[PDB]
Design a protein around this ligand. Structure first.
Ligand SMILES: *[C@@H]1O[C@H](CO)[C@@H](O[C@@H]2O[C@H](CO)[C@@H](O)[C@H](O)[C@H]2NC(C)=O)[C@H](O)[C@H]1NC(C)=O
Ligand SMILES: *[C@@H]1O[C@H](CO)[C@@H](O)[C@H](O)[C@H]1NC(C)=O
Ligand SMILES: *[C@@H]1O[C@H](CO)[C@@H](O)[C@H](O)[C@H]1NC(C)=O
Lengths: 123, 49, 49, 142, 107
């Protein structure tokens, strides 16, 4: 159906680079759709990272992750990428990208589409 | 400089003799095609504005 | 230009298509959702240029 | 009734229009200038005509077209009674073009309402490349 | 930078009743830029309520949101056994967004 899929878990050594990408199936990001990225640890709360607008291209980042994470959007495949460097032990968590469906006219004021996240670990 | 797309400027041409010989001979004109007239028959016509 | 010329703009969002030869600029804030965006921009409130 | 001034969105940053006839003139002019909510022109000294606060244009951004044309047939002084002049206009907005047709008729001796009968035709007056839709234009009354 | 605090820390009520939870902020608040989320164990969270009147696909009428000022509340008409999860409050209007801390509802 119209839905968002996510990549799989992976283990990366510290002091290196990590790339994350989540795809959309039967769903296009047009020019109004936007999406955010969140991280969930084990037995912890939810912390917001950043959300970007596909059309304008404006990006927002959390103050504590100003240089750590870079978020980019792709119109050709209608997806979102994150690049991170020098991951630490606290980064072993599940990453989700959440977007609301929107078709060139108007859309809901809440994020109802969701993925299943990537479990990233550092060893 | 030309104005942006969303703020195009329209200029009024009147009371003059239109010579299209200078226009036609420019090399990089990679798009020149007309609808109600033909490009070679603009030198012997008269327009209101 | 090498550094990039950023003085050319074009609209992105508009509620309705414009009839032929409509030119008068407008730079208000286009709302996306049913929530009425006012003044500053934010979620579902985007600059249209 | 005075003359033609109209702009789109009341923000001082839009290419407004001026078909202006202040005293004995008309200058067709297309340019960006500030329009107030209620910029008045003549309200001064109970009932005598003075061009007070007449200016409605402050800041220019882009002037495109300027042209000269004479004002419509006006008379001098104002009072109540002897309804004589009958001025008819039809305004049309088609395909980014503003068209005005006008007609003037004297000695219409008909005081109590009741638009006079008979037939008359309106000759075309001017065609303007405004480039905007109109649900919003104005010709203020003195 | 706005902080969202949820109360109570835990909820222990028998199934078949009405439940209430609250979350409050510090800075200014807006009625339709606050959303409530639930997260099943092992599953990604899904949208429940946003704007205090809007609902997602297949949301039962039991869910309700109340409050106009800083304090917002979630009311559940009739609980069912697998509805027990952690609830989060999320804000949009203010500075870079922050979630809540989570409230565990149990028997
Ligand atoms: C009347 O015409 C004007 C001029 O075309 C319209 O203004 C455009 O409106 C859209 C949506 O509001 C804007 O995004 C455009 O930027 C405006 N035009 C330009 C050139 O900037 C106006 O919307 C029209 N009004 C109606 C009711 O149709
Ligand atoms: C009409 O416009 C011209 C152009 O500036 C001006 O010189 C003239 O004074 C105007 N007419 C009146 C009655 O002010
Ligand atoms: C006419 O108006 C001017 C200023 O607009 C004022 O100074 C003057 O007193 C007025 N005269 C009368 C008779 O109202």
């Amino acid at each position: 159906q119209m839905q968002l899929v996510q990549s799989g878990p992976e283990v990366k050594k510290p002091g290196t680079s990590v790339k994350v990408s989540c795809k959309a199936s039967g769903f296009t990001f047009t020019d109004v759709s936007s999406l955010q990225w969140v991280r969930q640890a084990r037995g912890q709360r939810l912390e917001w990272i950043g959300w970007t607008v596909v059309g304008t291209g404006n990006t927002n980042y959390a103050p504590r992750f100003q240089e750590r994470v870079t978020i980019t959007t792709d119109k050709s495949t209608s997806t979102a990428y994150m690049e991170l460097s020098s991951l630490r032990s606290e980064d072993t968590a599940v990453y989700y990208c959440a977007a609301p469906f929107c078709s060139e006219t108007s859309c809901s004021d809440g994020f109802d589409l969701w993925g299943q996240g990537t479990k990233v670990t550092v060893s | 400089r030309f104005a942006s797309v969303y703020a195009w400027n329209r200029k009024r041409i009147s009371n003059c003799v239109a010579d299209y010989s200078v226009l036609y001979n420019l090399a990089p004109f990679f798009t020149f095609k007309c609808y109600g007239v033909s490009p070679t028959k603009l030198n012997d016509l008269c327009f209101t504005n | 230009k090498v550094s990039g010329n950023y003085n050319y703009l074009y609209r992105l969002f508009r509620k309705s298509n414009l009839k032929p030869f409509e030119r008068d600029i407008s730079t208000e804030i286009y709302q996306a959702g049913n929530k009425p965006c006012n003044g500053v921009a934010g979620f579902n409130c985007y600059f249209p240029l | 009734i005075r003359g033609w001034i109209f702009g789109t969105t009341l923000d001082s940053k839009t290419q407004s229009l001026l078909i202006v006839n202040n005293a004995t003139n008309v200058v067709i002019k297309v340019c960006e200038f500030q329009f107030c909510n209620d910029p008045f022109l003549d309200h001064k000294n109970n009932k005598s005509w003075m061009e007070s606060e007449f200016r409605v244009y402050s800041s220019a951004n882009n002037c495109t077209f300027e042209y000269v044309s004479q004002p419509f047939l006006m008379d001098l002084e104002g009072k109540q009674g002897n309804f004589k002049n009958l001025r008819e206009f039809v305004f049309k907005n088609i395909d980014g073009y503003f068209k005005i047709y006008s007609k003037h008729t004297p000695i219409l001796v008909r005081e109590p309402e009741d638009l006079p009968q008979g037939f008359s035709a309106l000759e075309p007056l001017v065609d303007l490349p405004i480039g905007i839709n109109i649900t919003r234009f104005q010709t203020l009354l003195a | 930078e706005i902080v969202l605090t949820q109360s109570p820390g835990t909820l222990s009520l028998s199934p078949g009743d009405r439940a209430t939870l609250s979350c409050r902020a510090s800075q200014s608040v807006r009625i339709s830029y606050l959303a409530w989320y639930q997260q099943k164990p092992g599953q990604a969270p899904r949208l429940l309520i946003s704007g205090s009147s809007s609902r997602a696909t297949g949301i039962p009428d039991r869910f309700s949101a109340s409050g106009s000022g800083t304090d917002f509340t979630l009311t559940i008409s009739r609980l069912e056994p697998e509805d027990f999860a952690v609830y989060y409050c999320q804000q949009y209007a203010n500075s870079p967004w922050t979630f809540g801390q989570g409230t565990k509802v149990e028997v």
